[PDB]
Each structure stands twice: as C-alpha cells, then as structure tokens.
Amino acid sequence: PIDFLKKEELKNIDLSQMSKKERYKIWKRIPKCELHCHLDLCFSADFFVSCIRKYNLQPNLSDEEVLDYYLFAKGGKSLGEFVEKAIKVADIFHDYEVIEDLAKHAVFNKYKEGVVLMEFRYSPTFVAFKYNLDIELIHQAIVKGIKEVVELLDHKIHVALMCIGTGHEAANIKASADFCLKHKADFVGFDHGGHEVDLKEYKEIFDYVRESGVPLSVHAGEDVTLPNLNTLYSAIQVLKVERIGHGIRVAESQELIDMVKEKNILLEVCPISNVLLKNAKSMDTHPIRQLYDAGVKVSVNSDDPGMFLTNINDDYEELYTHLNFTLEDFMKMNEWALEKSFMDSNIKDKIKNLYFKGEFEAYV
Numbered sequence: 001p002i003d004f005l006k007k008e009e010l011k012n013i014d015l016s017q018m019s020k021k022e023r024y025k026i027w028k029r030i031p032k033c034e035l036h037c038h039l040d041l042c043f044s045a046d047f048f049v050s051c052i053r054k055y056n057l058q059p060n061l062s063d064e065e066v067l068d069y070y071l072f073a074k075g076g077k078s079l080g081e082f083v084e085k086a087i088k089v090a091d092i093f094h095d096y097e098v099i100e101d102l103a104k105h106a107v108f109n110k111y112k113e114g115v116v117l118m119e120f121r122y123s124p125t126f127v128a129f130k131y132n133l134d135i136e137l138i139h140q141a142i143v144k145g146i147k148e149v150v151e152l153l154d155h156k157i158h159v160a161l162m163c164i165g166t167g168h169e170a171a172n173i174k175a176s177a178d179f180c181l182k183h184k185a186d187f188v189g190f191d192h193g194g195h196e197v198d199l200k201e202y203k204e205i206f207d208y209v210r211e212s213g214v215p216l217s218v219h220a221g222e223d224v225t226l227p228n229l230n231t232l233y234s235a236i237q238v239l240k241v242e243r244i245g246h247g248i249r250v251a252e253s254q255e256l257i258d259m260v261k262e263k264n265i266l267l268e269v270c271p272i273s274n275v276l277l278k279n280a281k282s283m284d285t286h287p288i289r290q291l292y293d294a295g296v297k298v299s300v301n302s303d304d305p306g307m308f309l310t311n312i313n314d315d316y317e318e319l320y321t322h323l324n325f326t327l328e329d330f331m332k333m334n335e336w337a338l339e340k341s342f343m344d345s346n347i348k349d350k351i352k353n354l355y356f357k358g359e360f361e362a363y364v
C-alpha cells in the first residue's frame with residue numbers, strides 16, 4: 001500500500017537532493033486526483049505494439065516505426081495533426097476484448113502511479129467508427145474492465161467515467177449526449193473533444209445534459225491556432241461548465257482570468273500534452289505558472305498517456321523541473337481537483353479523510 005504523503009509531512013522532504021528516480025518515488029506518493037485522462041488513449045507502448053501485431057496491422061514496420069507512425073511521443077504540428085493521428089490509432093479498436101483489456105490495464109497503471117481518484121473519459125462514437133462497433137457493448141466492456149480491477153484492488157482507487165462528444169455535427173453530439181444520459185448511472189460528466197469548435201451553437205444540447213443533472217467540462221482554450229478566444233467565452237457563459245479541459249489560453253486575457261476565478265471554475269491542465277501539440281512553446285513557458293500565480297484553480301492531468309508514452313507522474317516531474325512548483329503546490333492542486341470532481345460527495349468525503357486531512361503548518 002503506497003505510503004501517501006501527508007500535508008503535515010511535506011516540509012520534511014528535500015527534493016533538491018534527490019535523483020530523478022527518487023523524485024518519481026515522491027511523485028508516486030502524492031495522493032493524486034486526476035480529472036482529464038482519455039481512457040481510449042491511455043496505454044503503454046508495449047500494449048499498443050501488441051495490439052498492432054495481434055491484428056497484423058503493420059507487417060512492414062518495426063516496433064519503432066509503428067510508434068512513430070501512430071503516436072505523438074516526439075510531438076507534432078498541432079491539435080489538428082493530433083486529431084489526424086487519433087483517427088489512425090483507431091486501427092486498434094478491432095473488437096470488444098481489446099477494449100476491455102485496455103480498460104483493465106489503464107486502471108491498473110493509474111493505481112500503481114498513486115492516483116486515488118480518477119475520472120476517465122472516452123468517446124463512444126469515436127471508439128466505434130473504425131469497425132462499426134456497437135456503443136452499448138463498448139461501454140459494457142469498459143465498465144466491466146474497470147469494475148473488475150477496482151474490485152480486485154479493494155476500492156483503493158476510485159474511478160468514474162465521463163462521456164465525450166466529438167466533432168462538429170449536431171447529430172453526433174446529440175447522439176453522445178443521449179448516450180451519456182441513458183447511461184447516467186455510469187457517467188458523471190459530459191465533454192466535447194476533437195477539433196476545437198465554438199460550442200455555443202449546440203447550447204440546447206448541453207443545456208439538456210446539464211439540466212438533467214450531468215455537469216459539463218468541455219475542451220476549450222487549448223488550440224493556440226484559433227484566431228480568437230470565442231470557444232472560452234462560449235464554454236463559460238453559454239455552456240456554464242464547472243471545469244474546462246485545458247483552458248490555458250485563459251492566460252491571454254485578463255477578462256477571462258477574472259471570469260474563471262469569479263465563477264470558481266477549475267482548469268484541467270495537461271502540461272505535456274500542450275507542449276507536444278505545440279500549444280505551449282516549451283514547458284518553461286507553459287501558462288500554468290502564470291495562471292496558478294494569478295489565483296486560478298488548476299489541476300494536473302496526463303490527457304493521453306498512450307499518445308505521449310507518458311504517465312501522470314511525468315507531468316509532475318516537468319512542472320517541478322521546469323517551473324519550480326513545490327510539493328505544497330501539488331497537494332493544493334490535488335485537493336482542488338478533489339473538491340471539483342464530479343464523483344459522489346460520499347466518495348469525495350472518504351478521499352478527503354483518507355488523504356487530505358491535515359494542514360501544512362502547525363497551529364501557532
């Protein structure tokens with residue numbers, strides 16, 4: 001059982017005297033609450049390469065060329081290109097067995113990384129398109145795979161699901177919204193991913209989801225190539241989201257920074273994703289430092305461990321190494337993520353008690 005760091009204990013840890021390996025041991029011991037991780041793009045290199053071989057998908061490529069062709073581990077051009085490679089990766093959604101395996105593995109690896117609260121998200125209609133799978137059996141496979149691992153683990157990690165709509169056709173977004181609500185019992189939130197579009201047009205679809213009791217967190221303010229910040233205004237003012245996926249472009253506008261703070265919105269920051277997709281110049285210039293210092297609530301997230309060949313503790317390493325975040329900062333961020341989690345209040349209460357009970361400093 002991971003020896004999770006406690007709030008009152010952090011002042012005794014000297015990270016400056018540690019090797020990279022020893023720091024990773026400390027990142028593992030942070031009780032992490034992760035809000036933004038696409039389960040359908042969450043795997044290791046090994047898992048991915050097996051899948052490709054299992055279905056004889058690339059007989060002309062070495063393992064290394066398969067990783068290069070399909071994934072984004074060295075970074076790319078833009079979110080646009082990222083969306084194009086995701087489409088390619090859908091080569092592996094061959095059947096429901098591989099899907100269930102994917103879900104077991106993803107949860108197991110989060111557990112070993114020291115995540116205690118995990119909101120996974122996935123896009124059913126996406127996962128279905130390549131082989132025209134049935135979204136109902138896709139969901140059953142994922143829920144089954146998750147339940148089995150959580151049970152095996154004695155509920156040591158708490159997992160919830162969010163449903164993502166993708167694309168810019170009302171028909172597909174509506175079909176996802178209906179699926180999400182049909183499966184309200186499993187889904188705790190509703191998202192939009194894919195190319196970044198202004199969601200204001202789909203107001204009535206999102207209203208209906210939000211008003212049926214499923215809160216919203218949509219991808220917005222990620223893609224630096226958009227000619228304005230309209231997508232952020234829409235998510236906040238029209239969709240009335242509780243959280244924003246990425247939202248890093250909020251840093252470009254004092255008006256938006258004030259809006260997010262005043263509305264108590266949390267930004268689900270994905271540091272490595274933004275650098276690899278060219279939405280931040282380098283980790284040294286990542287807006288999370290500005291936003292955190294401006295008093296915006298932000299949490300740390302991996303986004304797509306499979307596309308980047310990373311895990312959540314790599315994001316912590318980069319933030320510590322490039323931007324000088326501290327263990328205190330990390331604990332504060334995870335407690336914000338805990339408070340803004342869409343999971344049941346009973347579960348959040350348990351987690352608070354288990355991991356976030358003390359205070360950083362003694363009463364004086």
Ligand SMILES: CSC[C@H]1O[C@@H](n2cnc3c2N=CNC[C@H]3O)[C@H](O)[C@@H]1O
Nearest residue numbers: 038040083086123126166193194219303
């Ligand atoms: C199997 S991924 C299904 C999808 O969800 C989308 N997505 C996955 N990871 C992210 C996605 N969308 C936008 N921003 C990049 C990243 O956060 C992806 O482009 C595809 O549209």
Ligand SMILES: [Zn+2]
Nearest residue numbers: 038193245303
């Ligand atoms: Zn994402």
